[PDB]
Amino acid sequence: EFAFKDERISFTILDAVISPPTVPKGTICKEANVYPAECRGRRSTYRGKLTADINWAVNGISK
Amino acid sequence: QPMIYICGECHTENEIKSRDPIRCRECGYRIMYKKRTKRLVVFDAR
Ligand SMILES: [Zn+2]
């Protein structure tokens, strides 16, 4: 909870999940998953998307 | 002929010219090996 011009913006993260590693969206591909043996040979990171549900609310009402 | 390349997972002989996106033209897997052709290399048996 912090202060705007005499309102009170309130955030909270309700839930956060990590997806298993896929290709980026828009990629024309057949097997959408990414396996570790690709990421060793191409020298990239084996990484999964993190995303959460933030709950913005001004002056106490969940909006 | 153009230089044959081989995909890592579905094994299709893709002929990558120098001006295209590199990808396999069946599945789309990005790591692509290179095909060994006929040429003479001399190794000693020692
Ligand atoms: Zn392929």
UniProtKB/Swiss-Prot annotation, chain A:
Signal peptide: none annotated. It is found in: Nucleus, Nucleolus; Chromosome. Catalytic core component of RNA polymerase I (Pol I), a DNA-dependent RNA polymerase which synthesizes ribosomal RNA precursors using the four ribonucleoside triphosphates as substrates. Transcribes 47S pre-rRNAs from multicopy rRNA gene clusters, giving rise to 5.8S, 18S and 28S ribosomal RNAs. Pol I-mediated transcription cycle proceeds through transcription initiation, transcription elongation and transcription termination stages. Component of the RNA polymerase I (Pol I) complex consisting of 13 subunits: a ten-subunit catalytic core composed of POLR1A/RPA1, POLR1B/RPA2, POLR1C/RPAC1, POLR1D/RPAC2, POLR1H/RPA12, POLR2E/RPABC1, POLR2F/RPABC2, POLR2H/RPABC3, POLR2K/RPABC4 and POLR2L/RPABC5; a mobile stalk subunit POLR1F/RPA43 protruding from the core and additional subunits homologous to general transcription factors POLR1E/RPA49 and POLR1G/RPA34. Part of Pol I pre-initiation complex (PIC), in which Pol I core assembles with RRN3 and promoter-bound UTBF and SL1/TIF-IB complex. It is linked to Treacher Collins syndrome 4: A form of Treacher Collins syndrome, a disorder of craniofacial development. Treacher Collins syndrome is characterized by a combination of bilateral downward slanting of the palpebral fissures, colobomas of the lower eyelids with a paucity of eyelashes medial to the defect, hypoplasia of the facial bones, cleft palate, malformation of the external ears, atresia of the external auditory canals, and bilateral conductive hearing loss. TCS4 inheritance pattern is autosomal dominant. The active site comprises the fork loops, the loops and the rudder that stabilize the transcription bubble and assist polymerase translocation. Belongs to the RNA polymerase beta chain family. This is DNA-directed RNA polymerase I subunit RPA2. It comes from Homo sapiens.
Swiss-Prot record, chain B:
GO terms for biological process: regulation of transcription by RNA polymerase I; transcription by RNA polymerase II; transcription by RNA polymerase III. Its main location: nucleus. It is found in: Nucleus; Nucleus, Nucleolus. Zn(2+) binds at C7, C10, C24, C27. A zinc finger (C4-type) spans 7-27. Keywords: DNA-directed RNA polymerase, Metal-binding, Nucleus, Transcription, Zinc, Zinc-finger. GO terms for cellular component: cytosol; nucleoplasm; nucleus; RNA polymerase I complex; RNA polymerase II, core complex; RNA polymerase III complex. One of its GO terms (molecular function) is DNA-directed RNA polymerase activity. It comes from the Eukaryota. Belongs to the archaeal Rpo12/eukaryotic RPC10 RNA polymerase subunit family. Component of the RNA polymerase I (Pol I), RNA polymerase II (Pol II) and RNA polymerase III (Pol III) complexes consisting of at least 13, 12 and 17 subunits, respectively. Pol I complex consists of a ten-subunit catalytic core composed of POLR1A/RPA1, POLR1B/RPA2, POLR1C/RPAC1, POLR1D/RPAC2, POLR1H/RPA12, POLR2E/RPABC1, POLR2F/RPABC2, POLR2H/RPABC3, POLR2K/RPABC4 and POLR2L/RPABC5; a mobile stalk subunit POLR1F/RPA43 protruding from the core and additional subunits homologous to general transcription factors POLR1E/RPA49 and POLR1G/RPA34. DNA-dependent RNA polymerase catalyzes the transcription of DNA into RNA using the four ribonucleoside triphosphates as substrates. Common component of RNA polymerases I, II and III which synthesize ribosomal RNA precursors, mRNA precursors and many functional non-coding RNAs, and a small RNAs, such as 5S rRNA and tRNAs, respectively. This is DNA-directed RNA polymerases I, II, and III subunit RPABC4. The lineage of its organism: Eukaryota, Metazoa, Chordata, Craniata, Vertebrata. The chain holds residues 13 to 58 of 58 of the full protein.
